[PDB]
Amino acid sequence: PFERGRTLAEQGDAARGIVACAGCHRADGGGDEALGAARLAGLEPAYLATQIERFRAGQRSHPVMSPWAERLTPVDIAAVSAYYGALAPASNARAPSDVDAAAGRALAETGDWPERDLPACVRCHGPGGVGAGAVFPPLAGQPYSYLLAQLQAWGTGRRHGEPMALMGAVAGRLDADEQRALAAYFATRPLARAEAASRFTPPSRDALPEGPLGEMVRLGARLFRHTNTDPRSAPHVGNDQTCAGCHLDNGRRADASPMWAAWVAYPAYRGKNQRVDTMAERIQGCFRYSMNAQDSVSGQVPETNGLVLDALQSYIFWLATGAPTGDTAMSGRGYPRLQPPAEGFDRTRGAALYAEHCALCHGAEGEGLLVDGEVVFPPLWGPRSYNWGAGMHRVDTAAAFIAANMPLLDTVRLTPQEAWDVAAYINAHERPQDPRFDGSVERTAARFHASPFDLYGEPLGVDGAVLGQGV
Amino acid sequence: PFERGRTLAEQGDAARGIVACAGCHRADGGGDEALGAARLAGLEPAYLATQIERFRAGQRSHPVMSPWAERLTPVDIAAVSAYYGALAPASNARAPSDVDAAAGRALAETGDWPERDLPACVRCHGPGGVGAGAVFPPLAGQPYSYLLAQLQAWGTGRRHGEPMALMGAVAGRLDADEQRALAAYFATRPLAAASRFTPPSRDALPEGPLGEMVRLGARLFRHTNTDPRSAPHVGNDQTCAGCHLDNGRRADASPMWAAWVAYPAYRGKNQRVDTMAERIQGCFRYSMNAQDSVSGQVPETNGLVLDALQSYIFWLATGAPTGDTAMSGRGYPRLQPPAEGFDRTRGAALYAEHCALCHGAEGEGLLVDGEVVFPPLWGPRSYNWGAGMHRVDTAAAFIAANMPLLDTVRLTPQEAWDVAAYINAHERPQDPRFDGSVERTAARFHASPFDLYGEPLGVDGAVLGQGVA
């Protein structure tokens, strides 16, 4: 299959009237700026084949490429897909000198949640745009002309068919200048409104504090976003999660437990441990439960006067600039609470919904996706998810998160009841044991999980075994 | 001695024309409400004698008592003072039923700094008004009639002569209703503004368990050295409230509300970003000298003491905007450095004039039943050599704005510089950063023009920074 692919890429098949693919995509698979021919080298074979079939189906049209896509046989398609997927990545990109690639960095890496509900390109396209599996292709090293053409296509409807209409929604929220900057930005990578709602605005990401405090704010922002991979916090993280995955826009997003609403609210009484909690104590709670620190290398939450807690507290403090001390009800805090359903919650409808609207990113078995060790799509159950003591294991809490925040891009927004059903499906799977586990599921259940929205201990596992055994 | 005093108290002296003192002050020395006769039992003999001489001088006048004071000889005065000071405390006080003693609790125990720059009565008269040495007499158990007459006398000029005219300034700031309430309050105790942030009133505590923590932090702040929870981490005779006046509420006396919103922060003193908890542990390390405490350690950072103090500081800061590092009132007002330097000899004069009355001739301060009334300013029970207050600029900024306690006197900046240099040119507990050499420790941690550690400005010009061993 690599042999048919090679001969089609390098020489074509004169008999069948098929030109060499390298005539336009070049010998290294690196693309061509002048023709707007894509990079093919190293792309996921399933993606290449899907794109050839998109051309054939009319979801994509290009006067140059569509005819070569129609002349392929199915066996030819699979061969060239495997050939280009086996190549070493390569790029023959060259961005224009008249376009400021730095102007795209903001959207590429942090998006625009506040004005456009728009995630960063890298939130789906992987770190630095190297791709995130077969669904989500790389942008890094694709020629400028090719990237800009696709964005122009989706923004006008001359390209469609992708899952959940995701790129139509993205392209629809960009202006022409941003399209050029984003294309130049990703073409030059290496291959390896609150006022009108009366809501708080955190400081711009350019406005860091001066001097050493600013360096710590930056570190706290990176520990928040890369909790599981940074050498300082990783030894205290026992799963494949980051703070940013449940606190969207790196802690800035109203209705996704923004950190600015939390800073001014602690110290506070918390019924979960029957105790008043500082911000540090709270952050250590998150390491204990959402980051599963017991299964970390260190086995422990981070030291309370160490650099990790100091940076995280500095970052959170900074996001809260201007907010009124002691306001425990800032608009945007936490997740919007839902009315509990009169008629319960149905994990079977939930599994249908999850397959429809979530599995694309989070996986058919909740396994999530990691790229070069970074969390792209968090695992939602199993041994690399949050553990049974984490707040997100509750049905009401996760339902409120989901209804307001998932799917990531708001082409779809679930009803409360749909959110309740999907939340009950997700949180009825095993995940790491409660750190408060006593040895007995019933006992641990009666002391720490005695709520109608907590399925720990209920007989909903495999062949009706009780939930709450771990992995 | 005590024997002449007794027979003067119990029988008088027929010959010299002296009636028995117990006829009005009673046998137990507890006073008498009907006569307005004072409690004498347990008062400091120096105070009793000073008062008798006040009558003789005309600084005090009362037609009932003045004649018995003029009939005493110097030997007699010393004798009766000795007898009444050796007696067990006692009181025959009985306050009116038509006067609400709780209306005095506020002024008695927390003052009115914000509107009248007026300290609590116990700030000078000791815990629960039981007295603070010879200068400061007890109010507890004094008859209502007696206390109110004295407060009325000072308010009209029928009593004077007390040091720095302190009680004339105090009584001048009370209305008649408050005078009755305070007298009722102390007779019934046992014998053992605009453009600036406003913290919450002391009645407006939070609901539930946070409120109990805020309460606790307020008392650790006020009683740091005696409370069982914080005392094991305090190695000197200090409290937070002593340098952070009005228990952390007073603008220009490093209020806590301006600090809550300023941390985390880079601090040049340790080259690092410090949380509020880390900042507070530093205060234990230096201002409270935790090294010479029982535990030898500062309080644990997620322990009860730190949690309570941070809850209290948080509460005081209600409403303040996060991240405002320049709230008006923060810290102490910075002084322009003197082109004339600072003169410890000038300073020692001023200290004897305006400070020793309370802080002691030798800076020793005063304690009553373990509570800090007047902090030691040097010696083994003061802040140590790493504490901010040991710096001349910092202490001068505190003094110029806040001492003497009551604003009948306010030093000029140059005076504040001079007194600060005198105070901070005395020995005190060693820097916790001491590395074995005074010269090295001075070069690494005290190389500033406003720091005298290491310089030869001590007793007979000895190098400062040797500690108290």
Ligand code: HEC
């Ligand atoms: C942030 C503004 C961006 C930019 C500049 C791009 N994307 Fe996406 N993208 C997504 C999916 C599912 C696809 C595959 C579509 C299909 O199957 O046909 C894409 C593809 C692209 C391309 C085309 C790449 C190619 O090889 O042709 C380009 C140029 C592109 N994207 C730019 C999904 C998402 C998201 C999921 C919610 C988010 C966010 C983005 N993309 C963000 C961006």
Ligand code: HEC
């Ligand atoms: C020039 C005449 C070309 C020849 C010969 C081939 N391709 Fe091509 N291809 C070309 C252009 C100009 C483009 C961009 C089209 C657009 O919509 O802008 C393409 C695109 C592809 C893609 C999609 C890439 C992606 O990132 O999604 C694939 C998978 C692709 N081409 C495969 C391909 C194969 C297998 C060829 C030989 C059979 C081939 N192309 C020839 C221009 C030209």
Ligand code: HEC
């Ligand atoms: C999902 C698995 C999460 C991950 C990973 C992290 N957090 Fe979290 N956090 C989460 C929820 C569902 C809630 C609210 C409900 C509850 O009772 O737990 C929180 C709350 C916080 C807070 C307090 C917010 C407030 O009171 O307004 C803080 C300060 C917080 N979380 C910090 C935090 C950090 C620093 C994380 C990475 C170490 C982190 N969280 C991960 C869900 C999840």
Ligand code: HEC
């Ligand atoms: C890709 C386009 C996604 C789809 C479709 C859905 N989710 Fe998602 N989710 C996605 C990302 C990138 C993240 C992390 C956010 C970040 O900034 O890094 C998430 C996060 C969650 C979480 C938080 C739990 C955790 O352990 O991190 C939950 C509970 C979650 N998502 C649920 C969820 C459901 C139920 C969906 C279908 C309705 C769904 N997601 C769609 C990316 C995508």
Ligand code: HEC
């Ligand atoms: C009734 C005729 C009395 C006799 C006999 C003595 N004292 Fe007296 N004393 C009396 C009154 C009504 C007052 C209050 C005067 C005022 O200005 O309000 C006093 C006051 C004193 C004081 C001052 C106490 C203080 O707390 O400052 C002292 C020290 C005192 N009296 C001592 C004293 C002695 C030693 C006596 C025997 C020689 C004596 N008093 C007799 C009423 C009467």
Ligand code: HEC
């Ligand atoms: C320090 C600035 C003081 C504050 C604050 C208060 N008082 Fe005071 N008081 C002070 C001194 C130095 C003296 C001694 C007077 C003397 O002649 O030496 C006093 C005395 C009193 C007395 C007289 C007691 C007696 O036995 O005669 C009373 C009744 C008194 N003080 C009341 C009082 C009240 C109610 C205060 C709070 C409002 C208060 N004092 C504060 C110094 C200081």
Ligand code: HEC
């Ligand atoms: C004098 C001997 C002090 C004692 C006892 C305590 N503190 Fe202190 N503190 C003191 C000084 C001179 C300063 C610096 C002020 C300046 O203008 O330079 C401080 C500072 C603090 C701060 C930071 C305030 C801010 O940044 O605005 C806090 C939070 C603080 N101090 C708390 C504190 C506590 C809780 C104490 C009892 C445990 C305490 N201090 C004692 C002087 C003295």
Ligand code: HEC
């Ligand atoms: C009694 C009337 C006082 C006079 C006169 C002076 N001071 Fe004072 N001082 C007094 C009290 C009760 C306190 C503690 C306040 C509290 O609310 O508990 C203080 C505090 C100081 C401090 C803080 C230092 C510390 O180690 O705690 C300093 C540096 C200080 N005072 C200096 C000072 C000087 C220089 C004075 C003469 C100008 C002076 N004080 C007069 C009570 C009294």
Ligand SMILES: [Cl-]
């Ligand atoms: Cl994002």
Ligand SMILES: [Cl-]
């Ligand atoms: Cl990939």
Ligand SMILES: [Cl-]
């Ligand atoms: Cl058009």
Ligand SMILES: [Cl-]
């Ligand atoms: Cl569109």
Ligand SMILES: [Cl-]
């Ligand atoms: Cl940043």
Ligand SMILES: [Cl-]
């Ligand atoms: Cl695991």
Ligand SMILES: [Cl-]
């Ligand atoms: Cl485990």
Ligand SMILES: [Cl-]
């Ligand atoms: Cl009288």
